Coordinates of C-alpha atoms in Angstrom, one line a residue:
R959 CA 0.2 -0.2 0.1
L960 CA 2.3 2.8 1.5
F961 CA 5.4 3.3 -0.9
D962 CA 8.2 6.0 -1.1
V963 CA 9.5 7.7 -4.1
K964 CA 13.3 8.9 -3.9
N965 CA 16.0 11.4 -5.6
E966 CA 20.1 11.2 -5.9
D967 CA 21.0 10.3 -2.1
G968 CA 17.8 8.2 -2.4
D969 CA 15.6 10.9 -0.9
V970 CA 11.9 10.6 -0.1
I971 CA 10.4 13.4 -2.4
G972 CA 7.0 11.9 -2.1
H973 CA 4.8 8.8 -2.3
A974 CA 3.1 6.1 -4.4
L975 CA -0.1 4.5 -3.4
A976 CA -1.6 1.2 -4.3
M977 CA -5.4 1.7 -4.4
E978 CA -8.4 0.5 -6.4
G979 CA -6.3 -1.8 -8.9
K980 CA -3.8 1.1 -9.7
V981 CA -0.6 2.4 -8.5
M982 CA -1.4 6.4 -8.1
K983 CA 1.3 8.7 -8.0
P984 CA 1.8 12.5 -8.5
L985 CA 3.6 13.4 -11.7
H986 CA 5.8 16.3 -10.3
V987 CA 7.1 13.7 -7.9
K988 CA 10.1 12.8 -10.3
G989 CA 11.8 9.9 -9.0
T990 CA 11.9 6.2 -8.8
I991 CA 9.4 4.6 -6.7
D992 CA 11.2 2.1 -4.3
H993 CA 9.8 -1.3 -5.1
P994 CA 11.8 -3.7 -7.2
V995 CA 8.6 -4.8 -9.3
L996 CA 6.6 -1.4 -9.2
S997 CA 9.7 0.4 -10.4
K998 CA 9.4 -1.4 -13.6
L999 CA 5.8 -0.9 -14.6
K1000 CA 4.4 1.2 -17.8
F1001 CA 2.9 4.3 -16.0
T1002 CA 0.7 6.5 -18.0
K1003 CA 0.0 10.4 -17.3
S1004 CA -3.0 12.4 -16.5
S1005 CA -1.4 15.8 -16.4
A1006 CA -4.8 17.5 -16.2
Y1007 CA -4.7 16.1 -12.6
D1008 CA -1.0 15.8 -11.7
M1009 CA -1.4 11.8 -11.5
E1010 CA 0.6 8.9 -13.0
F1011 CA -0.5 5.2 -12.8
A1012 CA 0.3 1.6 -13.5
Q1013 CA -1.8 -1.6 -13.4
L1014 CA -1.5 -3.4 -10.0
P1015 CA 0.7 -6.7 -10.6
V1016 CA -2.4 -9.1 -10.8
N1017 CA -2.0 -10.2 -7.1
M1018 CA -0.9 -7.2 -5.5
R1019 CA -4.4 -6.0 -5.9
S1020 CA -5.5 -7.7 -3.0
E1021 CA -3.7 -5.4 -1.0
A1022 CA -5.1 -2.2 -2.3
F1023 CA -6.5 0.4 -0.6
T1024 CA -10.2 1.4 -1.1
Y1025 CA -11.5 4.8 -2.2
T1026 CA -14.7 6.5 -1.0
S1027 CA -16.6 9.8 -2.1
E1028 CA -18.5 10.2 1.0
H1029 CA -16.7 13.1 2.7
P1030 CA -18.4 14.9 5.5
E1031 CA -17.4 17.6 7.0
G1032 CA -15.2 16.5 10.0
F1033 CA -11.7 15.4 10.9
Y1034 CA -10.0 12.9 8.4
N1035 CA -6.6 11.4 9.2
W1036 CA -3.0 11.6 7.8
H1037 CA 0.4 10.7 8.7
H1038 CA 0.9 14.0 10.7
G1039 CA -2.3 14.0 12.7
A1040 CA -6.0 15.5 11.6
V1041 CA -7.1 16.7 8.6
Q1042 CA -10.4 18.9 8.7
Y1043 CA -13.0 19.0 6.3
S1044 CA -13.6 22.5 6.5
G1045 CA -16.3 23.1 3.6
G1046 CA -15.0 21.6 0.6
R1047 CA -11.2 22.3 1.7
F1048 CA -9.2 19.7 3.4
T1049 CA -6.8 21.5 6.0
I1050 CA -4.1 21.1 8.0
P1051 CA -2.2 23.4 10.6
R1052 CA 0.1 25.8 9.3
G1053 CA 3.7 24.6 9.4
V1054 CA 2.7 21.0 9.1
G1055 CA 3.3 19.9 5.3
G1056 CA 5.9 19.9 2.6
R1057 CA 8.5 17.6 1.1
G1058 CA 7.5 14.1 1.5
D1059 CA 3.7 14.4 1.7
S1060 CA 2.9 14.6 -1.9
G1061 CA 1.2 11.0 -2.4
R1062 CA 0.0 10.6 1.0
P1063 CA -3.4 9.8 1.7
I1064 CA -6.1 11.1 3.9
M1065 CA -8.5 8.3 5.0
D1066 CA -11.8 8.3 6.9
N1067 CA -12.0 6.3 10.3
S1068 CA -13.2 3.2 8.4
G1069 CA -9.8 3.1 6.8
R1070 CA -10.8 4.2 3.3
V1071 CA -9.2 6.8 1.4
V1072 CA -10.7 10.3 0.7
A1073 CA -8.1 12.0 -1.1
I1074 CA -4.3 12.1 -2.1
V1075 CA -2.2 15.2 -1.3
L1076 CA -0.1 17.1 -4.1
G1077 CA 0.7 20.3 -2.3
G1078 CA -0.5 23.2 0.0
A1079 CA -1.5 26.9 0.3
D1080 CA -1.2 28.3 3.8
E1081 CA -4.3 30.6 4.2
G1082 CA -3.8 32.2 7.6
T1083 CA -3.3 29.9 10.3
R1084 CA -3.9 26.5 8.5
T1085 CA -2.8 25.2 5.0
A1086 CA -5.5 24.3 2.6
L1087 CA -4.4 21.2 0.5
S1088 CA -3.9 20.7 -3.0
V1089 CA -6.2 17.3 -3.4
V1090 CA -7.0 15.0 -6.1
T1091 CA -10.4 13.3 -5.3
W1092 CA -13.2 11.5 -7.0
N1093 CA -17.0 11.8 -6.7
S1094 CA -19.8 9.3 -7.5
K1095 CA -20.6 9.2 -11.4
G1096 CA -17.7 7.4 -12.0
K1097 CA -13.9 7.9 -11.1
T1098 CA -14.2 11.2 -11.5
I1099 CA -11.0 12.2 -10.7
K1100 CA -10.7 15.9 -9.2
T1101 CA -7.5 18.3 -8.8
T1102 CA -8.6 21.1 -6.1
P1103 CA -6.2 23.8 -5.7
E1104 CA -5.5 27.2 -4.0
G1105 CA -2.7 29.4 -4.7
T1106 CA -0.7 26.3 -3.9
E1107 CA 3.0 25.2 -3.8
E1108 CA 3.3 21.6 -4.9
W1109 CA 5.4 19.8 -2.5

C-alpha cells in the first residue's frame, strides 16, 4: 500500500499508493518508486490532474486501499495527525506539510481513502491542501487547488 519515491542520495520526495487496482503517483514527484517490481511498470500520465499510474501486479491488487467519495465535514486522518473538512477544503495546520507529503492519502476512520495530497497553500493559520479526489458518477477524478505550492 504505502510506498516511497526517492531522488539522488535516495531521498523521499514523495509517495506512491496502491489503490483500487492501480498505483497512483503525483507526476511532479520526479523519482523512482522504491519497489523492485513497481519501479518497472508502464505508467500513464494524466496531467490535467497531476497523476501517474500503472496497473497493479495481478496479486498485489488484493492489498490495495479502497477509495470513498463520502466526505462529510469533520476530521480525517493523515500521517501527521488530523485533517479537517472545512467546507470543501481539506486543511491542516500551518507548519505541518511539505516535502515528503505529495502522494500520501487522507482517510476516514473506516480506513478508506478520501483524497491524495499534491501540495498546500497556507491561508492564514492553516494550510488548505491541493487534493485529487473523485466523486460518484464514476471515478471523476478532481484536482482542487488554492494559490498552492506543490510539494
